[PDB]
Design a protein around this ligand. Structure first.
Ligand code: UP5
Ligand code: MG
Length: 193
């Protein structure tokens, strides 16, 4: 009857430019952008009894259990029948990914991982610049470095799992936004979107 939603995972390190590029894709393609980090922050800022577990894990650079995050994602997905979805910053974890694959296979068809490859030194500067005009409080050195380790230890393994099935599109993000987005747009255009 109706087609299953296409989902594209957008992965990459802290400040690689995931949210910046997903905003350009929403604009030009009309996909729904779901930042899993933001959805979790919104679950914390409302009550929940998962908040505070969410507060502290987020602050140490840890990955919240999928039983929270996959629910938040599935709810937004359910509410937006008719859309395709950019899920940003997920999956961070082998456990998050297995949960995705066992709870969401029947619902959506997950197309590829879009990986913004970026040097740590540039992501660090991008983030320290952002907090220097008081964007976030996550935007200090202790937090950035913790997230670097979680990315390096846990989420680089998800990426080359998906690369075993030729399911990772890599876009080097160490350029100007417009240089990076031209590649993004052209990819989405060639994928038939
Ligand atoms: N090409 C470019 N050149 C120069 N500047 C560029 C640029 N692109 C962007 N900027 C500039 O870079 C800064 C960061 O950008 P942004 O687009 O915001 O980057 P992004 O990759 O989205 O980085 P973000 O700051 O969101 O970091 P994280 O990916 O670390 O954070 P997230 O919000 O995804 O998650 C935070 C925490 O949530 C938790 N989490 C998140 C998801 C989940 O499934 N589970 C979960 O537990 C984890 O603890 C995680 O550490 C901005 O000032 C921007 O203007
Ligand atoms: Mg983001």
């Amino acid at each position: 009857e109706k087609s299953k939603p296409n989902v594209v995972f957008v992965l990459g390190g802290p400040g690689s430019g995931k949210g910046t590029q997903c905003a350009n894709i929403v604009r030009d393609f009309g996909w729904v952008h779901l930042s899993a980090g933001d959805l979790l922050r919104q679950e914390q800022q409302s009550g929940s009894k998962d908040g505070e577990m969410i507060a502290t894990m987020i602050k140490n650079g840890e990955i919240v259990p999928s039983i929270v995050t996959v629910k938040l994602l599935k709810n937004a997905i359910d509410a937006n029948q008719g859309k395709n979805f950019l899920v940003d910053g997920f999956p961070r974890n082998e456990e998050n990914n297995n949960s995705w694959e066992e709870n969401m296979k029947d619902f959506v068809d997950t197309k590829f991982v879009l990986f913004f490859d970026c040097p740590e030194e540039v992501m660090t500067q991008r983030l320290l610049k952002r907090g220097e005009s008081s964007g976030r409080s996550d935007d200090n050195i202790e937090s950035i470095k913790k997230r670097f380790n979680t990315f390096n230890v846990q989420t680089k393994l998800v990426i080359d799992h998906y690369n075993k099935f030729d399911k990772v599109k890599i876009i080097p993000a160490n350029r100007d936004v417009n240089e990076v987005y031209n590649d993004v747009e052209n990819l989405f255009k060639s994928m038939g979107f």
